[PDB]
């Protein structure tokens, strides 16, 4: 698959798109709460990250999202995040675009100094109002008083069972609607405006990077076929094996934080 081959493309590329998956947030120690042993109390993300869960028990879901807003205070961007950001900046000066398209909701790309980012699953640090629909940034710790010191991850921990009026509300006073995380739950659709934009960006691009996920799976699978059908190279950087015989074009196996920074220098 060869690094030099990749670097020759990288040198010439004027419009780079980098799609990032859970792997890159995992290297920063941010828990996914999915699959083997990633449990928050009795539940996993599948159970709590849904409209129904929120409608049924908005306290419990807000405990979950509060715990996750707070764990980010101690988790920092890994070198993949930074290498990307510094690349964007360096290339930008030269009149060369670098956009990030991320499934991750932790803002680690933003924290590493990336600017042109599309958070297709939203962000832990944005709220949406259930009444007026207003989307606003929110980095407050705690997000509201009632949740202070709540969200503890032990299967033991007693539910905070916060009254809905004391959960985060919409600060525009005529409204006072219940806020939810501005995030894409299971059973919800993506923003059409965001996908239209991403489509345009991937159509521009002449090098595409997949980092911390693969082309064959959501979300890369939506868009990689488009770029690939134009002859544009696609480089995967992730931790998955490649079969002995059927070597992938540009696949750099190993953790992003190691593989990516020398690729992008």
């Amino acid at each position: 698959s060869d690094l030099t081959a990749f670097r020759e493309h990288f040198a010439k590329a004027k419009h780079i798109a980098i799609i990032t998956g859970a792997g890159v947030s995992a290297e920063s120690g941010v828990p996914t709460f999915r699959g083997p042993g990633g449990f928050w109390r009795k539940w996993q993300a599948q159970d709590l990250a849904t409209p129904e869960a929120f409608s049924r028990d908005p306290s419990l879901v807000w405990e979950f999202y509060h715990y996750r807003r707070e764990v980010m205070r101690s988790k920092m961007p890994n070198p993949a995040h930074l290498a990307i950001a510094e690349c964007e900046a360096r290339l930008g000066q030269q009149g060369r675009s670098v956009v990030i398209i991320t499934q991750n909701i932790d803002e680690l790309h933003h924290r590493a100094g990336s600017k042109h980012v599309y958070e297709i699953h939203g962000s832990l640090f944005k709220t949406r109002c259930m009444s007026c629909g207003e989307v606003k940034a929110n980095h407050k710790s705690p997000i509201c008083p009632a949740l202070d010191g709540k969200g503890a991850p032990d299967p033991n921990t007693k539910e905070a069972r916060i009254p809905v009026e004391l959960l985060p509300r919409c600060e525009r006073k005529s409204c006072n609607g219940l806020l939810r995380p501005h995030v894409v739950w299971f059973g919800e659709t993506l923003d059409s405006d965001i996908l239209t934009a991403v489509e345009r960006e991937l159509e521009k691009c002449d090098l595409c990077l997949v980092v911390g996920t693969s082309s064959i799976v959501y979300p890369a699978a939506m868009f990689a076929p488009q770029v690939a059908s134009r002859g544009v190279p696609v480089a995967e950087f992730n931790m998955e094996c490649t079969p002995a015989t059927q070597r992938f074009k540009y696949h750099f196996e190993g953790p992003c934080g190691s593989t990516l920074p020398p690729a992008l220098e």
Partner: peptide
């Protein structure tokens, strides 16, 4: 609109 993760 696109079901997040196509549903499964």
């Amino acid at each position: 609109x696109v079901l997040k993760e196509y549903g499964v």
